[PDB]
Amino acid sequence: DRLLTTRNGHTTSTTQSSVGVTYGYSTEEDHVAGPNTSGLETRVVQAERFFKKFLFDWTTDKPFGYLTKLELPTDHHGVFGHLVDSYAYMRNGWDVEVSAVGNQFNGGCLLVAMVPEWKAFDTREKYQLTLFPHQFISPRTNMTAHITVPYLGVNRYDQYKKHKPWTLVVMVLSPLTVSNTAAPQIKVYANIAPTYVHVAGELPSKE
C-alpha cells in the first residue's frame, strides 16, 4: 500500500499507487511581503483548491519525445480566475497531481515535469528534461505523479495576463504498450491547486 491523500481547501484527492511527492527548487515560498507591493497585498485562501484539466490521450502511436504542455495559470472559472481579473498583481505556487490510469498490464513510461520559463525544446534537449522538478508514471508501478513547486520569477509579484512562470509538461519517454489484458489507451488528467495565493492592486469595476 502506497496511499496518499492530499487536501487543498474543501477539496481532497487520494491515490493508492503513490510514489511520493517531488518538491522543486525549494520546500517553501520566499517572502510574500516585499517592497514592491508596499503593505497592500493580501492572501486569498478561498482560491486554494483543486481545479481540473484534461491533458491528452496516451496512445500506442505516440513515440518518444511526444510532448503536451500546459502553461500556468490557465483559464480558470472559479475564484482564482476572478482574482486575475480583479487585481493588478499576483503570486502563488502550484500543487500538481497528474493521473494516467490504464491497468497493470500496460507498459511504457511518461515523464511529468514542471518547467520555469518555457521554451520549445529540441529533440536533443528532451534527453535532459529531468533537470527540472519531475516524476515518472509507469503502469507497472503507479497511476499518479505529484509535484509541488513555489512561486518564482524576476519579479516578486506578477501580471499573469502578460507572463506565465510555470508550465506543466508530460512527455512520452517509452511508448505505451497494450495486450489483450491491457487498457487500449490511457487518458491523462491533471488535478491542480494554486498555493499561497496573494494579490495586490485592486482594479476598478467594469460597470
Partner: protein, 49 residues
C-alpha cells in the same frame, strides 16, 4: 570568491568596487547541494558478501 587571486586588500571601498546586496527576512540556500547530498547510497534488500 571565484577566480581572484590577489593577496593585497583592494584600494577601492567595497561600495564602489561592487553593487551592495540587501536582504529581507549569502546563506545556505543551495538547493542542488542539498539534493545531491540527500542521494541514496545504500543497498535496498539483504546482502550476501
Amino acid at each position: 570568491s571565484g577566480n581572484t587571486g590577489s593577496i593585497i586588500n583592494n584600494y577601492y571601498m567595497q561600495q564602489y568596487q561592487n553593487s551592495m546586496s540587501t536582504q529581507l527576512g549569502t546563506q545556505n540556500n543551495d538547493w542542488f547541494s542539498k539534493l545531491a547530498s540527500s542521494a541514496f547510497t545504500g543497498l535496498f534488500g539483504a546482502l550476501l558478501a
